[PDB]
């Protein structure tokens, strides 16, 4: 381990991607992180997220850039504090189950896997965690999905062979 303090102040993203957070190069070096590393982010009350880390030359050394989706998963606001640590060797998922949030799919017609999930996950090797809510663009409107279960649990890589389940009743917004 690097032995160094691993708390960072939450800052906004420049490129919106649900799976990425960004640090300065000095901070990456302090924490022995490489670009594309899987990292585990922690907030309070056991809230967690798995992301990939990238290096951004405009990010302040004591901050972490993360989008609104990741911030909501961690239950933080801009300016709140999280921790970041290595999460090596995240296993490839056998299967995951996601369900849409009801108010994001009300009235929609069309196959949610083809329009939303397949292009989102295809050949992207996204890390994901049980309990995540993630926003996907497609069609006419953006859809939010909750990760109901993963196998392995609670997190995995959504790899080419990972089976994607999305049958069931849409979930109420919490």
């Amino acid at each position: 381990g690097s032995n160094r303090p691993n708390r960072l102040i939450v800052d906004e993203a420049i490129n919106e991607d649900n799976s990425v957070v960004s640090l300065s190069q000095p901070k990456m070096d302090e924490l022995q992180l490489f670009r594309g590393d899987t990292v585990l982010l922690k907030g309070k009350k056991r809230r967690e997220a798995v992301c990939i880390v990238l290096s951004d030359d405009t990010c302040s050394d004591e901050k972490i850039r993360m989008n609104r989706v990741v911030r909501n998963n961690l239950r933080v606001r801009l300016g709140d504090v999280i921790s970041i640590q290595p999460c090596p060797d995240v296993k490839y998922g056998k299967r995951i189950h996601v369900l849409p949030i009801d108010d994001t799919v009300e009235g929609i017609t069309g196959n949610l896997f083809e329009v939303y999930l397949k292009p989102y996950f295809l050949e992207a090797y996204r890390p994901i965690r049980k309990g995540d809510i993630f926003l996907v663009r497609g069609g006419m409107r953006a859809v939010e999905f909750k990760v109901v279960e993963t196998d392995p649990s609670p997190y995995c890589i959504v790899a080419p062979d990972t089976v994607i389940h999305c049958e069931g009743e849409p979930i109420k917004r919490a």
Binding site: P160, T162, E167
Partner: peptide, 11 residues
């Protein structure tokens, strides 16, 4: 719904 009900979808 229960978890992993059905055949799922392949990428």
């Amino acid at each position: 719904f229960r978890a992993f009900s059905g055949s799922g979808n392949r990428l």
